[model samples]
Target: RKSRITNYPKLEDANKAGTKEGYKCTLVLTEGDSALSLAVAGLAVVGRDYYGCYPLRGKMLNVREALKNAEIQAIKKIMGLQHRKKYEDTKSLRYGHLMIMTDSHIKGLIINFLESSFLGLLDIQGFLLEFITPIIKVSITKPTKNTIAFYNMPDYEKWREEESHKFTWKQKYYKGLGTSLAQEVREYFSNLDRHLKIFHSLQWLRQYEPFINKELILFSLADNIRSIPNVLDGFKPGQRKVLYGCFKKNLKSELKVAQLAPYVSECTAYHHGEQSLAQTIIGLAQNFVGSNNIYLLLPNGAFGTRATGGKDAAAARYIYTELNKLTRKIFHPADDPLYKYIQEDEKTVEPEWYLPILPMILVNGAEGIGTGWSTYIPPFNPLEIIKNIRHLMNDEELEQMHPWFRGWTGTIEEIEPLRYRMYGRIEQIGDNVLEITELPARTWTSTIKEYLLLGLSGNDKIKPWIKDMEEQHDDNIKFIITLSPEEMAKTRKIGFYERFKLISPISLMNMVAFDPHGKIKKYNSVNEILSEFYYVRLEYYQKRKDHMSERLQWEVEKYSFQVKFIKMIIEKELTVTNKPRNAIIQELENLGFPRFNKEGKPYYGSPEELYGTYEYLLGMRIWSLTKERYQKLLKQKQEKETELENLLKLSAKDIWNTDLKAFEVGYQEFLQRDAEARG
Candidate 1:
């Protein structure tokens, strides 16, 4: 910021002073010395500490003469130049906003030209396009401690005439920066801050849209992709809310859907309809949707089948639901330090995840329309994602992986480069007869059956070998098909499995999600997406470390008491210290116990005192005795120390391991399966 600030009070100086917070900052670039002085005066009177003055010190400077393509390129070069990753990653401009502030005079108009040129080509987030130019000077009554002066003499006379009054005032345009009345300078600059204007300035640039047949940047359709999905820790926004709501009432015992739907909608106030909520939890619980433990709900009712998912779910109230045994690993609200609660709707509170467990978008897979934006990534096995995450962090060669849905009795074959073609298992039982054993995530039993019936209506070449079909209700997934061999020879096709669904090939593209950095970002690969998760984890881990540090300090307080208590027991013969069991308290200070002043900046009263230690010592009779207790005390001390050590010692790799191991089931076979499949 200092480099960008050409004059004094650079951005660095203000940041050092601790004024800039988030989006709070003001930069004043004055056009002339008198204008600068007046602007400075205005800033002073207002006591704007966040405002910084950058005098236009260059010789005869005019932005009108400076606006150019080369100048724009030079400007970008000055800010985050090395960070230009546009061809690869969409680069972000470093500055907040550029205020085209100059003297509001004939010279002011020139600076205006400069800003308008730059703004027309403003590629930055959004510019401080509000151009403010203050009057150089004004005279009213006389110039003592105050005044207001201006031209447009006839207009002023007209205003005076209309107001039913008349006044005589002489005006002389004036001033210089360094030579101005320094104390009165603020008065002049004060008007600068107060002045406002709209001009022949450009608001937005429109780039020609190749597809839209339009010229302008915004008119063309550009992909509005969100950032990496897994950047969110516990879960995405909706996923996080669902789990938080569940955790509040997440029963280990089975709960009915009646108590379920309303609980989530009312509690979270996000009404993930009974249909969607029940269905999501159900699909995860089905053991066939593939994401095993990720879904927090413990499903009791029908989670549908491996073939067709979702239903009325038993229709009776007897079916129950509970959280998965391991669901706590991902969404343990009690221990989730990352979740932030903020007020939103009328008195309603919501849990917002600043981070997520893994690239949840990849783990659970997400798709929506922005809905102006949409994302689609397939769900991978839990350990499968964990392994790839480790490899990426270790900088090891990443294994190419595909979606792994549970009960996916289908083979993912490549139809083209990076394109996946899924095929379900079909087994032959008799001549021209086959049974549909399994289907892909994209298949629906009813839909498949509908097509099967359509084929039997005689469109399939051999009419499926001209055989009849019998549906199996067990898996509710597969159906048996028999064919007539004599007819099979005719069209060279079998009727039994005649109208099997051949879903259109799917291509895995970019992943758009909300990353922990609070950015809704886009990622190109599983490795890239997972790598982002690691970075976010590292960041959140720092926040976690802060939490741990806080707990450690609390532990220190607890242990500090034990130390004082044990010492009191031995030195004061503290057993005699506890004459009676429930004798309502006495201040140990009265009993010759010197109250210890806590070690810190001393403050009056109990603010910085450690009197609680002695109080514990007074209640200390047998509370400090026995090996069971002594070692228990020692163990508490030891555990606290180790927790701090491990937490502090947690390296990036260690954190990587910890995240995976937290839910680790020794599911290393996923690593092998992924490698083999990709190979």
Candidate 2:
């Protein structure tokens, strides 16, 4: 940068003669003529083409003393400083690094403080460095050799005891750059790493460090909450809220998309705007070819299509949505009680994350950009995923899976590890007639059509071959083109698919998501994600089993009480008529009635508080204490006994196997339903 000030100091330009890359020139600010001459001599001996020098006379003027002084104004103009622009707008920045080269450490620090305070208004304090010059130089001469030593003030103090070494030693103290020899100056600059110290303000750091940490951490936390998907369920918080709201409302009938957001808020106290929540509901419900592999919510109306890549979907007020029947199968109701739910005020909301039957993260995939990180998980085939889970169960190594979009007839070929080339289906149906049947995942038909039109009109590569084009897409993509015979031959020879936008590259290199423990982790392969999910999902199944057994045991105990009470009443062994409630309770307690502790465990209690109550016997009807009622109670107790026994007999592995089988069966039914309703 060039300054307009009339009294500006003489400046040397960096010799960036034949460099290939653009240079970030370094400015060596020296203290007046004395230090400047030394720097010039050093540069001549130990040459660096990118380092430039400028001189500031004597001590720099403080901003408090002279804010608009000639030196301050010249420095600002030379560095290309704007009044309010941030350091990000660095196109006009003259230097990348500022080296303050003074004669001594104290003078160097003084110059640094003045420069930093003046330049920090533009937030460029990170670019300054101070040049360190040795204050003492020692020459130790022996008979055969001469040794030399260099030290700053602190190092000289540490070496004070060594000054008494018994040898012919000569030492020279440097009070200023004028007293230093040219050879010594050249030697210092030659080993520049030892001579440069990066400048920073300790006061500035102390004042702003806490604020920086607080704001950054807050932003990162919010970003992760809204952006990253949970590994167990593959849902960001917004999507999770929508699903939880649907579940809480037990939605079976179609509800207008406009009303859905408020319903979710009613259930979970979702505090955000309704528009985003409605859009999230639409995303879950969309059944378009490349939208969602498994539709959790049914698209009752026009949610969106692949034509415009789901962006042209109907408005929220016009569309309706309902939960898919298969959703409950995926997130089993049996595991609901075991979930760690969140509570807001008096309302109970969903768990931090939901456990799905399969690793939905792999099934649906996810892509997001957070503050400090990002994620991109590509969807895998459901059938292939199931086969891998079976392999995992059998302790066999998993098979590598590729991206598979539901309802897409296009092909995805692996071009490299974790990378693929997606190709749309385009074929010649008849002579001079070519038709495109399907497009790659999320590739809009409108985008392809627009590109083709641009090529045809703008006389692009495809312009010479095509004669005419027609679009006839209803429920599926269909783009027909008429080509001249000779031109078609030329186009085929040159590479039609490559020149057109039919083939696109996709990478699965960024598979990042929050794991079951709520820690963000990167997955190298789909198998890695599946492996982590296997442990968590399997553990949850064990918890489900334990919960089911406990509930069954409670049911059996209740049924046992009912059956015993009925039998006793029928046989005239227990009487409640004309009897005090405490007397009846004592009789029931003495008859070995079941008693449970606070945590629902069977426990022996003191006689001061009776566990068994007379309510069951007292509430019995006179006409219904027959053998039939007693028989019904026995049948119910027997059923509960058998159910509890079977649940206890199965392990976590068995439960997982059963769930996997159920998901497969339900997924197939969904496929059938989807197929029959195709347009």
Candidate 3:
């Protein structure tokens, strides 16, 4: 009769015979046609608890491909809007609870493929935005070979007596779900109580909707082999071309091409305007800012460089003249309220403000930018401004005032309008009034009854309003006042006020008469500014000769210390050789010392020569003699000494010199033998 068992040994019998006498028994099936079949056999043998078995198929690659395709199909179906609506109906299906199991070697491969595919799919779907749920479990079967038993078998005598043997078949067998019997498949599922528990224990099932959707989509796509190849093919051809084309076509107009075009135009305009403006402003500024002229009385040939075409001589004369003028213009005291704080008649000293404008250029410098909305103003000096105004009054030189008002000076001072006195009267009858002058050219008269009847009463607000009207009249008077003076003296030129009134209304005239009206005119470039800046710096060194001399002296002192240290090292090497000084000199000649002349030679020339030549030899004695080795050792010692000396000097120069004397005393110890070195 044919038995239900398909394998050589019955699994039920193996389980019963293998169990220990007094322990709770569990059955494990070693070999079966399928995992389901084995599980069924185990359940029948054990008759209890929770028995679980994972089902796996032979041919790991083929199984993976099949599962991938199923997953991809499932994702595609779920991802479809219409199909997603159907998902609620299929929600009861426990698809996540299913586990895949394989033989040890194949299990690793399957797990790796699944993990790689899953992560890759998630990355593509941007699943980091989603929450994830853990429901799937991977199960693996143990290795079937008996190598463990053989290795652990104890006693060589027992092995020899038993005549140990090895199994001939080293291959393993794997079965799939299709090969399992119907009853076996049912028993396999009956052992999945733990899987049921795991499925129920998942709390994120409700909270992780987005993650579930993403994971489902990713897993589904990864399983589809055909679709994966198609997706990969899309990336093979260069992606840049497609991306560039899309950007050029779709994003072109959205980039605000028209709005941004004007900024480019404005920038071009600004650059052109800035070039011209900077040149003009700097030229006008240089003419008056920190510049002056003075009369100089000098002896003939008092100025140097006269022989060189008198260029340097002329420059010296101009320098003296400018210094004298600066002393008078900026530093001279006056009764004006603005300048009263400065001592009266201050002996015509130089004002700090009258110093070279180049320092100001070095610090803040000039810069201009023209945006469509407005243009930036560069900075200017107030003292230069006042001087420029004064120069404008005296010389009628409009350019002098240009530097004073061209840019934004740091802060502005308050301005109070000058008041004007008026004396006038009017006669009134009906709607008509007549004015009569007390001083005909300077005044007019108005009747008191007429003023009251005409509502010409002066209140707090009326006073200011009337004052403004009077100031306007005064401006006209002032303009004509200069005109008469010019007319009387034909040689005298018309002032700016008279000229401005002729060309434009008094109110419309520029506050600063020298203001540039059109595009800024060029006077200089960045390179020119930089060159002038460098020239000023060079002059600082030339002018401060004493300061430079002191700096040089300090540098020489530093070199002297270095020379003295080298001399001390030379002396140490001289003591190494006990031979006569002449023999030491011969050694020095062999080491590349030049022979000294009798006149140049010292009484200890032979000894000193020996010391100098043996300095390198002494260095070698102190450390390894390689080029880099000796250099590094000496360099470290020199650096440390220099650092300490610098620090001591910073605290007190005299104290540091005292420390140096102590260092000299310490040097005597190094010159002796062990006993002398200890002193």
- Which of the numbered candidates is closest to the native, going by highest lDDT? 2
Scored by lDDT, model 1 comes in at 0.49
Superposed Cα RMSD, model 2: 18.3
Residue-by-residue lDDT tens digits, candidate 2, 183-247: 66677566552223211112122110013457557646766767789999999877888898888
Clash count (model 1, backbone only): 38
Candidate rank order under lDDT: 2, 1, 3
| The 10-residue segment with the lowest total lDDT in model 2 | 201-210
Q: Please estimate how well model 3 matches the true structure, expressed as its whole-model Cα lDDT.
A: 0.27
Q: Model 2 lDDT vs. the true structure?
A: 0.71
Task: Show where candidate 2 strays beyond 4 Å.
Answer: 1-212, 273-275, 459-465, 596-604, 607-624
Per-residue C-alpha lDDT of model 1 across residues 491-523, encoded as one tens digit per residue: 345322333663435566645666655556666
Q: lDDT for every model? A: 0.49, 0.71, 0.27
Q: Give the true-structure RMSD of model 1.
A: 24.1
In angstroms, the error of model 1 at 160 is: 66
Total backbone clashes of candidate 2, pairs 3 or more residues apart or in separate chains: 0
| lDDT, residue 434, candidate 2 | 81
